[PDB]
Amino acid sequence: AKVHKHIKANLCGKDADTTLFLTEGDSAIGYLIDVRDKELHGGYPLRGKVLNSWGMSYADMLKNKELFDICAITGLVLGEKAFEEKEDGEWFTFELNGDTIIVNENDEVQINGKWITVGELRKNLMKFVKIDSSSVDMKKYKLQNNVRRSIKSSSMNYANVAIMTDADHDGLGSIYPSLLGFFSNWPELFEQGRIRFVKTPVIIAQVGKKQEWFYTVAEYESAKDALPKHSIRYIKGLGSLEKSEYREMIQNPVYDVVKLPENWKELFEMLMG
Amino acid sequence: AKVHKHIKANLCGKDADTTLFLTEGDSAIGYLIDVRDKELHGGYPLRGKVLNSWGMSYADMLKNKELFDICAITGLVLGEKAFEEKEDGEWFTFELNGDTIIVNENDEVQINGKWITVGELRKNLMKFVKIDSSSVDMKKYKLQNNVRRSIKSSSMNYANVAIMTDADHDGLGSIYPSLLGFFSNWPELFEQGRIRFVKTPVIIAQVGKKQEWFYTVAEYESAKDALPKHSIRYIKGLGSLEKSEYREMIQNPVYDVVKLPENWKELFEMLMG
Amino acid sequence: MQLNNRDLKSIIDNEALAYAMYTVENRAIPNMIDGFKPVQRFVIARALDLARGNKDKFHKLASIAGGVADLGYHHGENSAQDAGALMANTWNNNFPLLDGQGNFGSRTVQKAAASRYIFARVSKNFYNVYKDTEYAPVHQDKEHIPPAFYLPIIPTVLLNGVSGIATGYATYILPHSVSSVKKAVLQALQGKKVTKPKVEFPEFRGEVVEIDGQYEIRGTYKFTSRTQMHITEIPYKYDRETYVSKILDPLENKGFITWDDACGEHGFGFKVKFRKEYSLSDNEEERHAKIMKDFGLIERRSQNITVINEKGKLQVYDNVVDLIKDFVEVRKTYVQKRIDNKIKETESAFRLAFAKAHFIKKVISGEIVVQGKTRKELTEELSKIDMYSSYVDKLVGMNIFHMTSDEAKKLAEEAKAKKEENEYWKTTDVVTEYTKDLEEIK
Amino acid sequence: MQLNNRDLKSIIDNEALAYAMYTVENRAIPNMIDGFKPVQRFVIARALDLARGNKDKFHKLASIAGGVADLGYHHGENSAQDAGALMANTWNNNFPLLDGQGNFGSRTVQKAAASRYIFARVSKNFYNVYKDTEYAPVHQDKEHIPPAFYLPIIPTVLLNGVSGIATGYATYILPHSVSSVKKAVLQALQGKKVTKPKVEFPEFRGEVVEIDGQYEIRGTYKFTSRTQMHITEIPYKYDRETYVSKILDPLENKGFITWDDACGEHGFGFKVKFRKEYSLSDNEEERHAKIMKDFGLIERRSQNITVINEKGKLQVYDNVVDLIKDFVEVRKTYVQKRIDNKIKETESAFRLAFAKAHFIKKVISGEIVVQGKTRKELTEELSKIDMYSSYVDKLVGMNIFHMTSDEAKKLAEEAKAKKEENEYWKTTDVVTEYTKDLEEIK
């Protein structure tokens, strides 16, 4: 049904990519509404701590309001795969930005932030090296963020989810792992490179007219000496970025694309389990 | 039964005067233990807000822990007259410190902080004037705090009740009138002079070695001019007096001996009722 | 020991007049002179306290709200946090006295971020308008370090717009534009006919019209197609969530339109698609009326101007022009206090600077010989002169580079400049000094 | 649009190891050097910069606890309030580092008054012991204003007694007398055999002994008659409520005694009456043992000395003598640091003071003419001289009265005294200056 706090993208469920944001606090969406693309930048505020989802049944998942609202907004149904993989029988390799990439003929490749079909790319006259399926590095193929694994059809309307939280202790022992545990009900979502995390800088410089963004304190220490008359601003939370800084962090973002390894089924027991 | 928080004067229930103090909070009664006379200075700490006793049914008066503990420590049974006045048919009048005092042959008169029987005072060869019973001013007689009204026998083990509460809003809209509302169940106490209040100073000067006490701001403003090199310590609570000041305040107390006018049936309903 | 006779009547009397005194310090009605509610005055005083060192430094909102209790506030730091959050932003305030960095909300979403993330500072608006703070009336309560009220040049209560509810009393004031308020105040200063100030809500692109003494706030709409309309603005008190849930969602469930979100950086906006169920008459005026009725682009607000005067007594006003006429009369006295104290300060500074300059004129040529003496001997030897005696301690405790020729001319010119400033202050009145200071507001 | 491949292992290793860092930054274990838990260090830093202006001024404990969030404390204002209330009293501390005014509890009742009523300030003990606060290590976290640990002259951790519970660790240190600790540190500085400092509980009138490495705290009692006893003291861990409830109330319920309260200003006190049902042995030693068993005047406490050394690492000491030795070795380095920077400061002060003396002499005698010149020309003509190289701003920034003969002689004597101080600092080692500073503590 219709969700109240569901500032929504225009191309929701129209076979085009979206970037539905999952931001803590109803205040942080105040920026998103004014900075959205108005085409693919849906959002849904969520305030609090989502309950531990690794000890309770699927049936009573919908009892929680926020979790059910996320399910309805993103369109996934619990217990079923979020996509339908299309079968393939070809494999190719190529070099991009000095890095070897293993791809399939029915896969999707992102170049400068735009996903292009492999069939279209092969028509652009760029060197593709065909290899046997038995020689395909499965781990390297699954660890590539510029390759999408042959989506055929999808009942899922918001193509990507861009989790975005605070950086202080209200971000560490916080929503971020609980939302990840909830999304873990769908292994295919992560390997597809869909569930993501936006990196809010921790320290922002104020040199000249522009600024410099430091996603870690260690990076700030390492590049401090090359900073002319820099001013220091600790971003210990989402509600500490001005509108312009949020606009830059949204339209030109850095994604912590979370991938789940074969050991995921243990780390969720050791943490929050 | 025994009460844990019942710092108890030695002369409790031994036909001698006591001054049971009802000091708010178990903290501010820490001085009382080190400041008591160890004979007649009992105490009982109270933390919180006593439930309104006006219109409040007797069933849960004892179910309420604090109110039942108060009747336990003071030795009173609700619904029964606390006192027992002895009959008399003689009246006297005399001057004390330049003020005319109306007394009965069976009354008690307090001189220099000690209560002396009228019969014993008559043997001291000081002037007594006998007047008719119809000529006695009842209103003035009931308003005399140096006179006790014909005590025969007392069921209480503590003679007096001195209330000790904070001076700021933590006592204004708090225990201060609620305790009087509870004590009104035995109206004889107020007209006898039993219920009192220890006037906590609000502003203290620090001139020279000794110190000046200002019970309300008006006296402080009036006598500020005559204060050579004076300092201010806003006593907005009982836990702001050092040990020595609390010792002086307990050993040499000043009592606002409350009394019931004929309208006391009404002011307990106009507020807190 | 002393026994009094306080009785019970005085017990309940003092139980009141203290709770009443407790509420009086916490009346939600804004003070007329400065427009600050009691909580807002403490937040502003704390922000000024934190800003003595660096005026442009941004301090945490939690830090700002945690220091009001020491200043005299009694109602916790939550109220100060909320007041600062509502003060710092620009969508809620035509003239915001706190400059904020962080998420202080917008018209679409009016909720600010957590107070520990968002920083706040006193804006250049405050320093351009809030003058003569050192001259403000000292509070009757000595525990109140913030003054009785601040001294803004123009009636900020009409600048930002105030709403409040008290025990048996209510206030509601519409935010009047800054320039119109400045013009009205200037007309009051010159004694001319005072215009009724124009109400202009902040971050509002719609229409405001006054009818029968009530201000009708109207949104703006344009028809994109026969069944599609593009709302460009909505009444002020709607934010996106409540607007949608109270108008768009119930009637969408009722099934006459299929609206969509079009809110952007340019305030509000909603593109609507009309269904066949909804009925649109061909008359332009009737269609306009029904649109502004069902879709709620019209709203009526009534001012109930209750303010607290310079005497601390609660007052009610029929119209804003009387409020301005009283405000200028009250502020004229404080500008006069500034005038007088400035006369005294300028006179003392002129005498001190003249004596300091004359020290150089005596020293350089042949008169005063500091070259070998006893310090107390020198002080006594120069204190016999009447013009030297008054400021001898400052006059002698003076630096070495002052005997150079350039500093000699500098001190002489500074003394002459102080004299011109003195005769300027002596030849000025309230009208000129208030009109001149009523020209930096922008 | 940069995409990383951080996987789930890294995000789960950063979601953890940040909670670990958060709990490390505030741990109940006390530092070895200054003996402060993090909350106590923040409270001390707050009371210090609150006492920067007026040293003797008491501050409301609410302000002291509320100011810690600016400093860097994360666990709110309740923990700071409790730490300050526990640190300001004299019944709990042998060496109180905060002076108190208000109700800070006592041995009889250990609850202090509400934090909005009680005031606290840094005592003369802190300023007497905690020296070289400037030279304390700067914290790794730039957010934390207070230094990593303060620098006491004597190991304050051994004085007041510190207890705590940590995740996987537990500390407990008994209170040592200031005299014994000072003597032990003086022995350790000179390299002698350090005598084990005697534990002396503050405001404690009883007896303390060591049995098989366990400390037994003996209370004292006296028999006034055959069947009545006067308890004069009880072990440290009891207050009136807990002692009565856990000893006399169940024993009254059993019917053995009928106790009476006599505790007053002189600490504890209880008059006890013995009933016929209770049996008392005729033998003095057996009866004494029975009393000390049932009436609970015997308590045994053991020391678990786990403290953070100067490297931020946990270290467990078998006995306090090793703690004293390690602390002396660490503090010797900071005394050497103080020697070095003090040498630097007195050298600079000597050069600058010699420059002032020469300036005054040249000005008064015949050499430097400031009587008509330009400031830049004067600076360049007195700066070409090698001696007045980098002090021209201070050298010309002298005052008028310096030219007189008396202040000329005063500055010459000051320069000579600065030379003497420089020579003394250059010709001393750590032992002498640590010994000299280990003589003002009382």
From Swiss-Prot, chains A, B:
Keywords: ATP-binding, DNA-binding, Isomerase, Nucleotide-binding, Topoisomerase. InterPro entries: DNA_Topoisomerase_II, Topo_IIA-like_dom_sf, Topo_IIA_B_C, TOPRIM_C. GO terms for biological process: DNA topological change; sister chromatid segregation. It is an enzyme of class 5 (isomerase). One of its GO terms (molecular function) is DNA topoisomerase type II (double strand cut, ATP-hydrolyzing) activity. The keyword rRNA processing does not apply. Signal peptide: none annotated. It catalyses: ATP-dependent breakage, passage and rejoining of double-stranded DNA. The keyword Cytoplasm does not apply. Its EC number is 5.6.2.2. GO terms for cellular component: DNA topoisomerase type II (double strand cut, ATP-hydrolyzing) complex; protein-containing complex. Its cofactor is Mg(2+). Part of the DNA topoisomerase complex made of gp39, gp52 and gp60. There is a 50-nucleotide untranslated region in the coding sequence of gene 60. The ribosome apparently skips this region while reading the mRNA. Small subunit of the DNA topoisomerase that untwists superhelical DNA. Controls topological states of double-stranded DNA by transient breakage and subsequent rejoining of DNA strands. This is DNA topoisomerase small subunit. It comes from Enterobacteria phage T4. The gene is 60.
Swiss-Prot record, chains C, D:
GO terms for biological process: DNA topological change; sister chromatid segregation. It comes from the Viruses. SMART domains: TOP4c. Belongs to the type II topoisomerase family. It catalyses: ATP-dependent breakage, passage and rejoining of double-stranded DNA. This is DNA topoisomerase medium subunit. GO terms for cellular component: protein-containing complex. Its EC number is 5.6.2.2. Medium subunit of the DNA topoisomerase that untwists superhelical DNA. Controls topological states of double-stranded DNA by transient breakage and subsequent rejoining of DNA strands. Part of the DNA topoisomerase complex made of gp39, gp52 and gp60. Pfam families: DNA_topoisoIV (PF00521). Keywords: ATP-binding, DNA-binding, Isomerase, Nucleotide-binding, Topoisomerase. The active site is at Y117 (o-(5'-phospho-dna)-tyrosine intermediate). Residues 29-438 form the Topo IIA-type catalytic domain. Its cofactor is Mg(2+). GO terms for molecular function: ATP binding; DNA binding; DNA topoisomerase type II (double strand cut, ATP-hydrolyzing) activity. The lineage of its organism: Viruses, Duplodnaviria, Heunggongvirae, Uroviricota, Caudoviricetes.
